[PDB]
Amino acid sequence: PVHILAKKGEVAERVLVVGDPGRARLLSTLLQNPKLTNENRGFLVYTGKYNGETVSIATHGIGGPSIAIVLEELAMLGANVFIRYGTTGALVPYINLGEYIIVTGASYNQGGLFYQYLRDNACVASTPDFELTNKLVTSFSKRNLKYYVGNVFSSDAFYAEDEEFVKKWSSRGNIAVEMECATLFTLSKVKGWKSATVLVVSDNLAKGGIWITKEELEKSVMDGAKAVLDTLTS
Amino acid sequence: NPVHILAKKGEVAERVLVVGDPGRARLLSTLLQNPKLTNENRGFLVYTGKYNGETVSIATHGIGGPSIAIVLEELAMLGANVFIRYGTTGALVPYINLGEYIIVTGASYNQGGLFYQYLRDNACVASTPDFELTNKLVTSFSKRNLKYYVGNVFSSDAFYAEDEEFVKKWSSRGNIAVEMECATLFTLSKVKGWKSATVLVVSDNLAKGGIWITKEELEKSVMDGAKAVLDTLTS
Amino acid sequence: NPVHILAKKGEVAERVLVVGDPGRARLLSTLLQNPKLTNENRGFLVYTGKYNGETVSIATHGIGGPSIAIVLEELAMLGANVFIRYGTTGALVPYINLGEYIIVTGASYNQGGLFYQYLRDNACVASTPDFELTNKLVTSFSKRNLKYYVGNVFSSDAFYAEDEEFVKKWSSRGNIAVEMECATLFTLSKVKGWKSATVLVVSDNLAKGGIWITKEELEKSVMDGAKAVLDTLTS
Amino acid sequence: PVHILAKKGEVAERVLVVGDPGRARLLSTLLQNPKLTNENRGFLVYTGKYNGETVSIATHGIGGPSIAIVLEELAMLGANVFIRYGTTGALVPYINLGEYIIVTGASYNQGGLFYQYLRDNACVASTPDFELTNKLVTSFSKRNLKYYVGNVFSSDAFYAEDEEFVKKWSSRGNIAVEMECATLFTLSKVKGWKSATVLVVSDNLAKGGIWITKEELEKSVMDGAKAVLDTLTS
Amino acid sequence: PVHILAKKGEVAERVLVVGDPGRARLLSTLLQNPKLTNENRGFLVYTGKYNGETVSIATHGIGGPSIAIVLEELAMLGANVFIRYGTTGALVPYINLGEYIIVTGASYNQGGLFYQYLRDNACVASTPDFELTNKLVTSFSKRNLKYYVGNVFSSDAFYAEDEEFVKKWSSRGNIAVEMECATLFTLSKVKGWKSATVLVVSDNLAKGGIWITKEELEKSVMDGAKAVLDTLTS
Amino acid sequence: PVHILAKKGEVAERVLVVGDPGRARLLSTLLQNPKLTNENRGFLVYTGKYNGETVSIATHGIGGPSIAIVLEELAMLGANVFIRYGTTGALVPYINLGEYIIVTGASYNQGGLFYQYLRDNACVASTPDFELTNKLVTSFSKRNLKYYVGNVFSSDAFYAEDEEFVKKWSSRGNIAVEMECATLFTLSKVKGWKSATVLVVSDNLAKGGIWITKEELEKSVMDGAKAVLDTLTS
C-alpha cells in the first residue's frame, strides 16, 4: 500500500466506498466506535461497527484511475467486498432527485485503464456481483426507498462536450451517468472481489430545471447509506 | 416487412423463447398447447402455441450474432418484445457439471462489425439482460430444483479460431461459459427496448478434461430447462 | 470432430457449392445426379451427388460470418477444399437489373469480432477469392449467355442496422452490391488454403427504387446461375 | 463548478497543481498570507501571494479524469496558467532519487477521456507550453537543482501488470512515469491554457534502489516548489 | 497540381507508374519521341509513343502518402488508367528473382492515409481493376514470362522489425511485400480510376541467400515493361 | 542500405533533410566543397563542410514511409542528428508567408507505420529533441528571422477532403500542417537520434491569401537554411 497507509487488521473485509472524503467522514457517524485508519492523500478510511458487524467506509476519489488504486490497496489490506455509494445524473426524465439507482452494469469507452488491465480492447462484461446486487434491492425496498435498477455510463470526461449525450447513452440502455462503476466492476471480476453500486440521484441531465435542497439531499444520502450498510452487514 | 421470417402479423407472440437449432425448436414445441408452425423459411422454424394461459412462440435463430440479429429484428416487427434465449454452452470453469445450467447476467464480446454498425462507434455498451426477467428465471429454476450457476459469458464470433490461452483468458475475465449469441441479444434488446434473458445448458467443460453425459441425460437436461424457461416467460 | 455438420468422412466432396438457405440447397440438389442428403443437423442441409463426372456437394451455411465460418471449417475437416458461394444480394448501383448476376472479386468489411479472432489483430487482410476459380466462373457465365457484372461487395454483419448514407457510402467505396458472408469466406479460405469464389443473384437494387421481378423470373435466374456454378466447380 | 467551490476571485490565474492535498497544505506555507479558498471533496485550494503576484496551489487528486475536472473548474474560476508538480518513477538507470524531471511531452494509451474530448482516436501532440517549460528550466538552473528534460508516460493503471513495462516505455523515449501529464497537456492545448510540469523522482523502476531519507525527499519537494513558484511568477 | 507541373494535354490518359525516377527515365527509352513533361520534386514524367499509342511513364516515389499525391495530380492532368510497375520481396520460397507477380489485391494495416480518405476504419476491398489485371496476365504469358498471381502486403515501415513477418503475411494469403499497392487500389476505387500492378521480384524474404546480378535484373525490368506497355496500349 | 547508396564515411553525423531533391541541390551551395554522395532513386545527398564541421543535406521525398526509409539508411551510414527543413501551410490567421515555424511536436492519425514500429496503438509523445530545438530558436533569433513555436499536424493524405480541416487541427493545438514530422520525431525517440524541424510557411489555410513573390520565398528558404546549418554546427 503506497496510498492507503492502514496496518494489518485495520481495514475490514467489507467496505462501503464513496468518492467524497466528506461523505466518508459523515457516514462514519453511522458506525460505532469509528476509527480513522488512513487520511494519506486525502483518502479517508474509517473502520467501525454496524449491527455488531465490523465494516469500513473508504474514500476513492474521482475517476477510474483513482478508484482502481484505492480498490487495489484496500484489497491488499484485506478488503474483498465493495459497495460503491455515490451520486449520479439521471439520463431519463422520470427519475427524481434524491431517489436511487441500483446499478446492474456499466457502459464505457474503451482504452486507457481497461487496455492496461485487460491487455486488449475486448469489451469484457462490466457487471456487479449478482447476489450482492439483489441484496441491495431487498434492503432498499425493505426501507421503503424509491430506487430504479439499470445500467449506467461510466464517463471519464465530466466536461467533454457531446450535443447528443443524453439520447446517445439513454438509447444505449443506460439510465444514469457517473465515473467509477465500469472500473469497479471490471477490476472486481478480474481480481475476484464482490462488488455492487447504488447511486443517489443529485441531478437529472434529462431535466435541467429540477433541483433538490441541501437538507433534502443529505437526508437522501443518509437514508440510503443505512440501506447499504444493512446489506454490507447482512 | 420481414424477408426471412415469413410469418404473418398475429402469428408471432409477444413472448418468445429463442433457440439456435431448428431441431430444438421443433422438439420444444411439444411443450406448448396446440403448437402451430408459423414459419419455416430459410430454416428458421417458428412455432406458436399456448402455455399457462399465455400465447408463446418458440423461434429458431441460427448461429452467430448476424443471424440472431436478423431473427430478433423480424420477430419484433411481427410484435415480439420479450425474448429468452435457451441455448447450449461450454463451461470455462472446472466446478460446473455437464447438463447443469447457467443463467446469464452479462456477455463479454470483441468489438467490431455488428456492434459497430448498430452502435455507430466502438463504445463498450453494457451487454446485459433484463434484470426483472433474469431474477424470474432464477426463481423458476430454483422452484424446479435445477442446478444453475449465475454469471457472465463470452459471446465468441469464431468457434474455431485458435487461441492458446482461451479458457484461462476468459475465465480470468469473469466469464463462466462461452457461446455465440448473448452479446448481440442483450445489446440489441437494450437499443430496441426489448426485454431479454438467457439460460444455457452446459454440454461441455473446456476447463475440465472431456467428461461426458448420455444423450438421454442431455435431452432431459434440455427438456427440464425448457419447462422452467416457459414458466418464466409466462409468469 | 465436426459438432454441427454430422456427415461422415467420405460423405462430403472436395468441391462444394455453398448457399445460405437450406431450401435453396434442397432445390439445387436436383441438378446433381443421384443426390444424397449427407446432413440435416442444425438445419445445415448438405447434399452430395455427381455432375460432369465429378463428385460435388451442396451445403447450407446459414446467415452471417460466424455461421459460414463454422460450416466451412467443418466441411474442410470432412475433406472439402474448394468452395463457391452462390447467394442473393442487393445491388448498390442503378444500372444492375434484378435477376442478373454479380461475380465477386473482393469483399469490403468492418473489422472486429470474427476477423480479430482469426487474424489476431486488426490488419485489413485482402479479402479476395481465388483468381483462377473466379475467371472460370466468368467463363461459364459467359458460355451460358448470362448477364453478369464483376466487382467488389460489402459484407455487412447487421442487415437492419440504420445508416442514412448506406448506398452512397459503399458504392463510392467501389462495392456494387451488399451481402453478409463473402468477407468471411474469402479471408478464411486465404488463411486455410482453400480455393473459394462467389456469384450472387441480384434480388434487389438499393440504388434504384423498388423495381421487382416475378417469383418465377427469380427462380429461373437462380436455376440458370446454379448450372453455371456447377459447370465451374467441375471444370 | 460542482467540485471546487471556491468563490470567483478566490482563484489566481497562475496555479501550481499537485495531486496530494497534503502537499498542497504543506506548500501553501510558501505563499504570503495564504487563504484556503476550497475544501470540498478534499480538493484543497490555497490562494496567496509570491514575488508580487497572486498565486494558487490546488489539489487535483489521482488520474486524468480527476485532474481534468479540477483544471476545467479552476479555469472557469479564472485560472489559465497551470504548472503541475508531482512525484514520479524514473524509467532510466542514471536518474537518482530526489532529482527532478522537467516534462517535454507525454505518451499515453488512447482512452475514454481523450476520445470524449478529441472526438476520435487522433494522437494529438500532448506537449506543455514551450515558453513556460523553458522558464522552468531557467528557474531550476538558477536554484542549482539537478534536473533532466524528457517525455513521460502517463499511465491510467498504477497496478496493472506488464512484464516489459520499463523496457517498453523507456524504448519509446520516456524517462519517467506518472498519471496526469497527458491529460493536462492535451486539455490545455484544446482549451488554450498555458501548462507545464516538473516531477520529483521518488523511485527508480530501472534500478534496485537508492539510499535516501524521508527528509532528503522533504527538502527536494520544498526546493522544487520554490523553483516552480518562481517560474509561475516569472 | 502542386507537385507535378505538366500542362494541359501533356499527361496521357494511360500511365505506367514506377517509384524510382531512374526507372522512369530508363523505360522512357522504350517510347517514341519521349518528352520530359515534369521533373519538379524529382517526380520525372515522360510522355511518348508506344505501338502508335500515346502513354506516359511517371515517378511516384516511395510510400502511400507519396503515390497518393502523384496519382491525384496525374488524374487532375487527364490520367485515369494506372499500372504500377515495381519491385517486391517474395514471401514464399518457390518464386525466383527476376520473375513477376501480378497483384490481385493488397493487405494493409489500418489508419493514416486510409482513415483520412475513407473517414473511418472500414476495411474497404483494396483490389485492382479486374479487366486490366486479366489483360496483364495475357500479355505476360504471351511474352513467355514467368509470373505468379496473388495478393501482396503493402507495408508502411520498410525497416520496422517483426520476427514473424514472413509467416504472418504469407499465412494471410500474401505472396509478396511492397509499399504502394493498397494505396493505389483503394484510392483508385474511390476516385474511379482503372488500376493494376505487376511487380518484379528483386528479393525473396523467404530465402535470404538467393541473389540476381545487376544485368539480369535490368533485363527482367525491361522485358516486363514491354509486357506492361503492350497492355497499356492494347 | 538499398535506397541511399552513399559510401560509408560519405554521410555526416549531422544531417539537414528536405523533401525536395531540388531544394537539396540548391542548399548544397551553402556548404564548402559539396560532394554528391548519392543519386539513387532521386534521393540526392550532399556532403560538405560548414562552420568547421562535416554536414550532409539529404532528400527524404514525401510522406512518413519515405522519410522513415531515408532516416534509417542515413543512420546506418552514420547519421544521428537530423534537422528537417520543409514547407508548410499555417492553420492560424496571424502567421504570414515566408515566416517560420519551429516545431515542438506533431499530431498524427494512428496508422500503419506507427503500428509497425510501436507494435500497438499507444500515442507515444512525438516530440523533437528539446536541446536541439532551443538551439534552433537561438539561431533563428540571432539571424533576426520571424518564427513561431508550436505543434504541427503530420498528415498522410494531402488531397483527402475534410470540411472542418482548419478548425479541427487548429483547435487541437496545431499551428501548421505538413507530412513528415510525426514520423521523424517518433522514429528518432525510438532509435535514439537527435532531431528537430523548422518549416517555411508557403501558404495559409486560414486566410484568403497574402501577396508575396517567388523570390521573397527563395530568400526565405535560403535565410532559414543558413539558420539550420548554424544550428547543426552549433
Side-chain angles (χ1 to χ4, degrees), chain F residues 21-48:
Chain F
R23 177 185 284 192
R25 170 187 275 191
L26 186 70
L27 300 183
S28 65
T29 193
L30 288 177
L31 311 181
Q32 306 176 92
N33 200 201
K35 288 302 178 299
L36 183 63
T37 55
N38 177 258
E39 210 174 58
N40 192 56
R41 285 193 163 266
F43 289 118
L44 310 186
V45 175
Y46 294 86
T47 297

Side-chain angles (χ1 to χ4, degrees), chain A residues 2-160 162 165-197:
Chain A
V2 178
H3 308 78
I4 304 299
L5 312 183
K7 295 186 181 198
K8 170 167 189 292
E10 298 190 302
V11 180
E13 277 177 288
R14 283 95 72 197
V15 192
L16 189 170
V17 296
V18 299
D20 176 16
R23 187 180 281 358
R25 174 159 43 64
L26 180 59
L27 294 182
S28 70
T29 70
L30 293 178
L31 307 191
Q32 312 170 56
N33 289 305
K35 38 157 177 164
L36 187 304
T37 72
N38 171 259
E39 65 164 58
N40 184 64
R41 282 175 165 282
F43 296 114
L44 309 188
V45 183
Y46 296 87
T47 301
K49 303 291 197 59
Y50 190 86
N51 286 334
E53 213 64 67
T54 303
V55 299
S56 303
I57 303 176
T59 302
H60 67 229
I62 300 179
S66 186
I67 192 179
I69 277 171
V70 177
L71 288 168
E72 290 272 18
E73 303 200 338
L74 290 181
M76 284 170 87
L77 295 158
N80 46 250
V81 177
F82 310 90
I83 295 183
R84 170 172 146 62
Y85 185 44
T87 34
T88 186
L91 299 175
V92 291
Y94 61 77
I95 298 175
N96 306 302
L97 315 189
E99 310 193 314
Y100 321 79
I101 288 191
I102 290 176
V103 192
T104 53
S107 297
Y108 66 98
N109 283 304
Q110 69 187 323
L113 176 157
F114 301 85
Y115 172 63
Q116 292 184 78
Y117 273 109
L118 299 180
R119 303 181 179 64
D120 77 347
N121 296 304
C123 286
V124 169
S126 190
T127 55
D129 175 72
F130 187 68
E131 280 184 279
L132 189 63
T133 299
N134 277 323
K135 282 200 173 191
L136 281 168
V137 167
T138 302
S139 180
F140 275 70
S141 57
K142 175 180 296 192
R143 276 182 180 276
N144 299 302
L145 299 180
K146 194 66 263 277
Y147 65 84
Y148 295 89
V149 173
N151 296 335
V152 305
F153 164 51
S154 289
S155 167
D156 295 303
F158 192 93
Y159 289 102
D162 185 340
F165 194 80
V166 181
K167 183 286 186 295
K168 177 186 289 175
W169 297 108
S170 69
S171 67
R172 282 168 171 184
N174 305 285
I175 58 175
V177 57
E178 51 82 63
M179 305 174 69
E180 297 77 28
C181 286
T183 300
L184 170 63
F185 299 162
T186 302
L187 193 54
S188 292
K189 294 282 177 171
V190 173
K191 293 277 179 173
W193 303 326
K194 292 189 172 189
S195 297
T197 294

Side-chain angles (χ1 to χ4, degrees), chain E residues 53-76:
Chain E
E53 213 64 67
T54 303
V55 299
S56 303
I57 303 176
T59 302
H60 67 229
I62 300 179
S66 186
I67 192 179
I69 277 171
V70 177
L71 288 168
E72 290 271 18
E73 303 200 338
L74 290 181
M76 284 170 87

Side-chain angles (χ1 to χ4, degrees), chain D residues 171-221:
Chain D
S171 79
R172 290 171 159 185
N174 301 291
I175 59 170
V177 53
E178 53 88 56
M179 307 177 72
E180 301 81 22
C181 286
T183 297
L184 172 64
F185 299 162
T186 298
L187 232 195
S188 295
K189 286 293 186 174
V190 173
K191 297 279 177 170
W193 309 323
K194 284 182 178 288
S195 308
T197 296
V198 181
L199 304 170
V200 182
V201 180
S202 56
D203 178 40
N204 191 305
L205 307 178
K207 296 283 285 302
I210 302 178
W211 294 62
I212 64 171
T213 60
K214 300 171 193 178
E215 53 197 7
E216 179 221 67
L217 177 164
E218 293 167 357
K219 181 187 165 53
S220 179
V221 168

Side-chain angles (χ1 to χ4, degrees), chain D residues 99-157:
Chain D
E99 302 194 304
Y100 317 81
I101 285 166
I102 291 180
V103 189
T104 53
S107 296
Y108 64 98
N109 280 306
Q110 258 161 203
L113 182 157
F114 300 91
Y115 175 57
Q116 291 184 77
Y117 272 115
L118 303 176
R119 297 166 190 140
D120 83 346
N121 71 329
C123 289
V124 181
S126 187
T127 53
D129 180 70
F130 192 78
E131 281 192 275
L132 223 199
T133 301
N134 277 320
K135 281 178 178 177
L136 273 174
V137 166
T138 297
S139 296
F140 274 74
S141 172
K142 288 177 181 174
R143 278 182 182 277
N144 292 308
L145 298 179
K146 289 283 150 278
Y147 64 88
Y148 301 84
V149 187
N151 294 161
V152 311
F153 162 51
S154 293
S155 171
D156 298 302

